[PDB]
């Protein structure tokens, strides 16, 4: 308390996005920097952010005035491809990484090659270059603030991109089920995580055990009357659907932007001018002097 004026004068505020805490500049400082002998070539970042109820994944290359986005892929549009509930789960995180990997490859014109893996058996296999062809698109995973951790959804999307024909360097260290006694990953355990095995196994356990929590949680799955075994089916159907049309169909955008501005402005607080400020103090000075 009692913030001194000298402190206010001398306080060097950090960068705006550091003040908000959203951007770790020390780490961005070495991501977006580029080999100076590669003068104009952008260095693309595969940025994934796990907000509540949605997954944000996008491809970002830095310019002088600000970051430009090639193409983005969120989890709000996943219902179009068949993923309805639990758009934040680990399996969805893999799917949204697959979706953006397909999206960017088709936007660049490299869809016909680098199919990644059509059959996902969950083994650590990078997307190598083909013999005498354009190189695989190289993007760098900028997870941001959230901690690196084995089995984190952030590396679920990592596996999604690297299985989507997009070459993002990584090690099998942070994928779920990474053993410490031996450096073998479990393809069966990943394949479960790809299709929600860590979720369907909790489906069936609760369903076998009780119904209170099983009906409280997972309510939308109960609404569609879809069982855990169908979770694998719907995730697959999403994958080939994603591999069928990643062309980024937008929404219908009813009540378009000028109307959007129109309604916001009515409920939007305005700012006074000097005349209001002069009037307000005069009324306040008179009130405080009005026999007080």
């Amino acid at each position: 308390d009692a913030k001194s004026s000298a402190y206010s004068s001398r306080f060097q505020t950090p960068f705006r996005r550091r003040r908000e805490g959203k951007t770790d500049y020390y780490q961005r400082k070495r991501l977006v920097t580029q080999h100076k002998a590669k003068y104009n070539t952008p260095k693309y970042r595969l940025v994934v952010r796990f907000t509540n109820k949605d997954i944000i994944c996008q491809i970002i290359s830095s310019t002088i005035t600000g970051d430009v986005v090639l193409a983005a892929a969120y989890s709000h549009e996943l219902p179009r491809y068949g993923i309805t509930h639990g758009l934040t789960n680990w399996a969805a995180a893999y799917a949204t990484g697959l979706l953006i990997a397909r999206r960017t490859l088709q936007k660049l014109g490299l869809d016909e090659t680098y199919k990644g893996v059509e059959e996902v058996e969950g083994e650590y296999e990078l997307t190598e270059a083909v013999e005498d062809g354009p190189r695989p698109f190289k993007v760098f995973l900028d997870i941001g603030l959230q901690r690196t951790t084995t089995g984190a959804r952030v590396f679920g999307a990592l596996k999604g991109a690297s299985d989507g024909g997009l070459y993002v360097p990584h090690s099998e260290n942070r994928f779920p089920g990474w053993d410490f006694e031996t450096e073998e990953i479990d393809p069966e355990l990943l394949r479960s995580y790809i299709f929600g095995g860590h979720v369907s196994q909790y489906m069936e356990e609760l369903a076998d055990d009780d119904e209170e929590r099983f009906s409280e949680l997972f309510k939308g799955y109960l609404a569609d009357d879809i069982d855990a075994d169908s979770l694998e089916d719907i995730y697959t159907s999403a994958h080939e659907a994603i591999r069928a049309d990643p062309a980024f169909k937008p929404t219908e955008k009813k009540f378009t932007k000028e109307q959007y501005a129109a309604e916001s402005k009515k409920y939007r607080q305005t700012k006074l001018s000097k005349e209001e400020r002069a009037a307000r103090v005069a009324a306040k000075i008179a009130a405080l002097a009005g026999q007080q």
Partner: protein, 169 residues
């Protein structure tokens, strides 16, 4: 008025200070284990004092933090000997509070040999829901002035819960 603005216990820290290192610490550790059901951590000495028998880095205290319904249970059994009544003092400017007891081994569970008798220190950290906003890594901010906790808000919460009363002195 507002449902979720109601206060709740965040954590109790169960503090003990031991002059030396040895079997007393070991039994101090295990009495806290049977106290809270979770192993405590040996807070390590910070400086040398030459008068309290302390060299640097000699692990001169034991404490543990308890949260959740187990915290609700453990403060109840800890405040029963306190008699659900407390001094008008002991309340911090943020509304956190604490006090000390003299024994726990046979206070709530059967006493067993080779454990000694230890007094110790309670301290309750109580804040209303939303505390993550000042502890999360991303989008770290503060808690607004209304959301803060004060003496009158905490002591009032002390009244309605347990029907307790303050200022027994």
């Amino acid at each position: 008025q507002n449902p979720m603005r109601d206060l709740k216990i965040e954590k109790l820290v169960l503090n003990i200070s031991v002059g030396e290192s040895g079997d007393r610490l070991t039994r101090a550790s295990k009495v806290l284990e049977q106290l809270s059901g979770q192993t405590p951590v040996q807070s390590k000495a910070r400086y040398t004092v030459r008068t309290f028998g302390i060299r640097r880095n000699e692990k001169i205290a034991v404490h543990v933090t308890v949260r959740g319904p187990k915290a609700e249970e453990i403060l109840e059994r800890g405040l029963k000997v306190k008699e659900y009544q407390l001094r008008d003092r002991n309340f911090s400017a943020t509304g956190n509070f604490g006090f000390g007891i003299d024994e726990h081994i046979d206070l709530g569970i059967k006493y067993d040999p080779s454990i000694g008798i230890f007094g110790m220190d309670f301290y309750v950290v109580m804040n209303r829901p939303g505390a993550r906003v000042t502890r999360r890594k991303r989008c770290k901010g503060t808690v607004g002035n209304s959301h803060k906790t004060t003496k009158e808000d905490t002591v009032s919460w002390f009244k309605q819960k347990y029907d307790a009363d303050v200022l027994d002195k």
